[PDB]
């Protein structure tokens, strides 16, 4: 049985993710073959580092790539749903239900699940781009990464997000928020309260010039050059240095950036006269300077055409955690298209891992864009437990052997409320049966009131049963759920269809 051997393989990565997902989750130590210690809860980082052996794993891993590239969340939702969807299929296999009949069932359930998810909508983010509306989503996204640190990270992100979401109104066809709109840097030392946000670009390299600040005027004009700065060389061969700034400043420039090297006298004179000098090793970061300072790089040398100058409010050199950085930023004007997250933290693993979490929080806001992304679902398995009950109803409505598959299909959605419990340390022999009753009630009405809000208690508030998601404002993104169901349903269908693994001609 190839399908039996495949089940054995997925049991390995199922064990990996089963204990991973959740704010109470457990970290994994990952040793890079190049000599790096990686400790994270991100299963995408895990699978990137995990060598793949059994070809059936290649299906599940590439599935998580579809989720992670196309959606900034859902990594464990794919691995967790997929793991159990194939685990419960072992019962269907052993009951004698053929592979094609199991496949037909999961596809029939794909339609049932998607239609119900549309009915599970509780609220909707009205796209006010307000810090309060952002926090409603940013908090639960930061959750599952660092439990209890949401206060520090929420104030960091929601304020940083307001830097890259400018004042926009009547805008549903104008896209905003590129993933590169928020940069995160690492400064060894300090703690969470030592982190901050800069409204613009921060160079991790120490100040290279001798000038600390520009003038006090608003919208200090700035130049970027592409050609190497030296004594004017003729258009051909040749087998003035400082005169560049005499040309640049004509329009109002206090800051001169050189995308290339610097000539003899200018290295002294550009800084001597109080002008900031910059050369950037990252050429995409030069494209960032086009977005932060608004600077249009001059393709020629020593000829700052007026159209090749930008307007940047303030550029200064700043001290972060004792290690010096150079800041090219905007200030209440020519609003910066990039904001920088200043992470001060002493442990290089927690420091880097905090960045890994904030990177995902940035990605979540990309999904908070206009593509039908405001829809909210009830979190803490209220979506999952309610889906269980509604799926079993479709079983009663469905004649044939498809009834057997639908029944085992609902069982699979218990892995998410189970994982929330096993990681949190509440007895799965008590929390799970209390979840069933909390969501399974006889409502005097067609609208379940306060019974779609029943949650899973991951807090230390000792209580028999579970809590209400509105207490902490725990909502899940509908688009994350809907896309995840599509990925996992098709991914499990793929594994369930593998009848033989044949080596190609070699």
């Amino acid at each position: 049985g190839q399908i039996i051997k495949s089940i054995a393989a997925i049991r390995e990565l199922h064990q990996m993710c089963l204990t991973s997902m959740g704010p109470c989750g457990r970290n994994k130590i990952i040793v890079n073959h190049l000599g790096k210690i990686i400790i994270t809860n991100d299963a995408a980082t895990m699978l990137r580092e995990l060598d793949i052996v059994h070809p059936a794993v290649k299906v599940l891993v590439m599935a998580t790539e579809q989720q992670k590239i196309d959606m900034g969340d859902g990594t464990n939702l794919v691995m967790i749903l997929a793991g159990e969807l194939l685990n419960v299929s072992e019962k269907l296999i052993s009951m004698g239900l053929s592979a094609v009949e199991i496949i037909q069932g999961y596809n029939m359930a794909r339609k049932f699940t998607l239609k119900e998810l549309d009915e599970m909508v509780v609220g909707e983010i009205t796209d006010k781009n307000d810090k309060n509306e952002l926090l409603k989503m940013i908090k639960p996204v930061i959750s599952s990464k660092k439990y209890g640190s949401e206060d520090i990270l929420s104030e960091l992100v929601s304020e940083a997000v307001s830097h890259v979401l400018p004042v926009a109104q009547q805008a549903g066809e104008i896209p905003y928020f590129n993933v590169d709109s928020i940069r995160v840097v690492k400064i060894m030392g300090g703690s969470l309260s030592n982190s901050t946000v800069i409204k613009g670009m921060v160079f991790n390299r120490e100040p290279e010039g001798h000038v600390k600040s520009l003038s006090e005027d608003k919208k200090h004009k700035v130049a970027v050059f592409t050609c190497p700065l030296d004594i004017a060389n003729t258009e051909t061969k040749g087998t003035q240095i400082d005169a560049m700034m005499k040309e640049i400043a004509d329009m109002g420039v206090e800051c001169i950036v050189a995308g290339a090297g610097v000539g003899e006298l200018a290295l002294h004179y550009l800084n001597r006269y109080g002008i900031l000098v910059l050369k950037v090793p990252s050429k995409f970061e030069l494209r960032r300077l086009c977005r932060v300072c608004g600077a249009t790089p001059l393709p020629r040398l020593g000829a700052p055409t007026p159209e090749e100058l930008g307007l940047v409010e303030t550029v200064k050199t700043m001290e972060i955690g004792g290690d010096r950085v150079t800041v090219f930023k905007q200030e209440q004007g020519e609003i910066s298209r990039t904001s920088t997250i200043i992470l001060r933290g002493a442990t290089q693993n927690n420091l880097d891992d905090i960045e890994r979490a904030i990177d995902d929080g940035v990605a979540a806001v990309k999904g908070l864009m206009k593509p039908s992304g405001g829809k909210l679902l009830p979190g803490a398995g209220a979506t999952e437990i309610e889906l269980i009950s509604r799926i079993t109803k479709y079983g009663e409505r469905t004649p044939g052997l498809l009834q057997l598959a639908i029944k085992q299909f609902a069982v699979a959605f218990e892995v998410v409320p189970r994982t929330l419990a096993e990681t949190a340390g509440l007895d799965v022999n008590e929390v799970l049966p209390n979840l069933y009753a909390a969501h399974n009630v006889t409502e005097p009405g067609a609208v379940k009131t306060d019974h779609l809000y029943k949650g899973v208690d991951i807090d230390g508030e000792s209580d028999e049963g579970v809590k209400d998601i509105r207490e902490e404002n725990i909502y899940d993104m509908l688009a994350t759920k809907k896309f995840a169901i599509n990925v996992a349903t098709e991914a499990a269908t793929t594994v369930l269809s593998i009848d033989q693994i044949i080596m190609a001609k070699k």
């Binding site: 009951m95 009834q403 057997l404 799965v428 022999n429 008590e430």
Partner: protein, 477 residues
């Protein structure tokens, strides 16, 4: 938990052996002895007889089959299959869900109570005082025996047997014993060599194969006075007004003529143990020597005395008006023994219906009906017991599954059709053996004594607790 797992793996194997031993189309099992013997029997008792087991849990599966067979003459493989899957379906609940055995045991007890409710609901009443229907019932219920051509009397012989043994008491003072029957002891069947199966008859009393000493003798005395003696003496006998003289030892001509002169019959070779059986049905006093005969030698409670010869042996009828003796007739003692193999089996069939006047929907309709009724109860039951409660429902589907598998049909699709037939339709929908089709038990009767299903479930859950309650296997002498 590892020790409890090993107990589970034991019963799964016991069941896999017995699994396909159920049905008129049952597959045969090959018993290989180390001496080279090979037996293809379909008797699940014989299968369990030779199965050499390792885990003592399997030894309790054997003791379970002994318990069922001793009480209810049927239920052998029904209990082994049912009990094993009851344990097996609980396996992921033990290992994966981390459910403590005490929780699982408590859940099975609640399922037992609820299951007995369903068994009552699906029952069909039958009137045990309708002897004509009891003949049609027992004759069909003993189906597939060697005496089909003689089933008329091979059935009626058992009906007239249980007719009298019925332990009849009913009142609110002591209670209703419900016609408790002991076929082993209370019934003393006297198999008569000679005759044919259909010539077999039923008597009332005790019948002895001890022959008569003189061919001319008082043949019938309606109110005799029986002298039970082992050993002047012939005259001493008559002092107490006797009519029948029974001697333990051999008897000479003098005892024939002297007692005949006074109108007394002579019977020889009757041991004091048969003289005690005479006392059970008449009441004569057992005496050794004739000089010790006293006035207590009486022949009370003697309805009929008969001396007829059958099978080269004269018989002494101790007839009187929880005991009976059947005058079974057979061309040989092996034919008489063949009667037992088929007749006493009918006695169990009648014992079951006399135990409770109720029938069970066969063809597996009982089990699939339980699997549906438990499902409706499960979703209405709160607590962790929602998980183990469903285990019994999945276990009750194995019995109808084996009826399909041994019928050669699709074991998956036919079960799902049965589920829908019991869900929206009647509880009487079962499995046909020959056609392999889903049929209603109204058309294809196969109505089974309910007490078989009641004791099968009771003993299955009982043994399931015995297998789950064991936490380790420890060596000790």
């Amino acid at each position: 938990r590892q020790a409890q797992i090993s107990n589970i793996t034991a019963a799964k194997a016991v069941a896999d052996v017995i699994r396909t031993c159920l049905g008129p189309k049952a597959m045969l099992k090959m018993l290989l002895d180390p001496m080279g013997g090979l037996v293809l029997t379909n008797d699940g008792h014989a299968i369990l007889r030779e199965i050499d087991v390792a885990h003592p849990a399997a030894k309790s599966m054997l003791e379970l089959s002994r318990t069922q067979d001793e009480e209810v003459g049927d239920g052998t493989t029904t209990v082994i299959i049912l009990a094993g899957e009851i344990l097996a379906q609980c396996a992921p609940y033990l290992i994966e869900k981390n459910i403590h055995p005490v929780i699982i045991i408590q859940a099975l007890k609640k399922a037992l109570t609820d299951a007995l409710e369903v068994i009552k609901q699906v029952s069909k009443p039958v009137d045990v005082e309708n002897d004509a229907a009891m003949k049609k019932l027992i004759q069909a219920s003993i189906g597939t025996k060697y005496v089909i051509h003689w089933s008329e009397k091979m059935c009626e012989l058992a009906l007239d047997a249980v007719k009298t043994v019925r332990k009849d008491l009913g009142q609110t003072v002591e209670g209703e014993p419900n016609f408790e029957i002991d076929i082993k002891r209370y019934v003393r069947v006297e198999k008569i060599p000679g005759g044919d199966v259909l010539d077999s008859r039923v008597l009332k009393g005790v019948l002895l194969n001890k022959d008569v000493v003189h061919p001319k003798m008082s043949r019938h005395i309606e109110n005799p006075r029986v002298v039970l003696l082992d050993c002047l003496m012939c005259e001493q006998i008559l002092a107490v007004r006797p009519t029948l003289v029974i001697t333990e030892k051999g008897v000479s001509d003098l005892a024939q003529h002297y007692l005949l002169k006074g109108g007394c019959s002579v019977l020889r070779r009757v041991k004091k143990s048969d003289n005690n059986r005479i006392a059970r049905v008449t009441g004569a006093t057992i005496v050794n020597r004739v000089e010790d005969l006293k006035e207590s030698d009486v022949g009370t409670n003697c309805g009929l005395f008969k001396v007829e010869m059958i099978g080269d042996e004269y018989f002494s009828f101790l007839d009187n008006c929880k005991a009976c003796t059947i005058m079974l007739r057979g061309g040989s003692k092996d034919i008489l023994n063949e009667i037992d193999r088929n007749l006493q089996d009918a006695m169990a069939v009648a014992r079951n219906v006399m135990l409770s006047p109720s029938l069970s929907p066969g063809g597996g309709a009982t089990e699939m009906a339980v699997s549906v009724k438990l499902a409706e109860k499960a979703k209405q039951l709160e607590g962790i017991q929602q998980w183990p409660y469903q285990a019994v429902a999945d276990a009750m589907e194995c019995i109808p599954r084996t009826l399909i598998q041994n019928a050669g049909g699709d074991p998956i699709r036919l079960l799902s059709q049965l589920r829908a037939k019991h869900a929206q339709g009647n509880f009487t929908t079962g499995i046909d053996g020959d056609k392999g089709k889903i049929v209603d038990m109204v058309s294809y009767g196969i109505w089974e004594p309910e007490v078989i299903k009641q004791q099968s479930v009771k003993t299955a859950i009982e043994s399931a607790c015995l297998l789950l309650r064991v936490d380790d296997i420890v060596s000790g002498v």
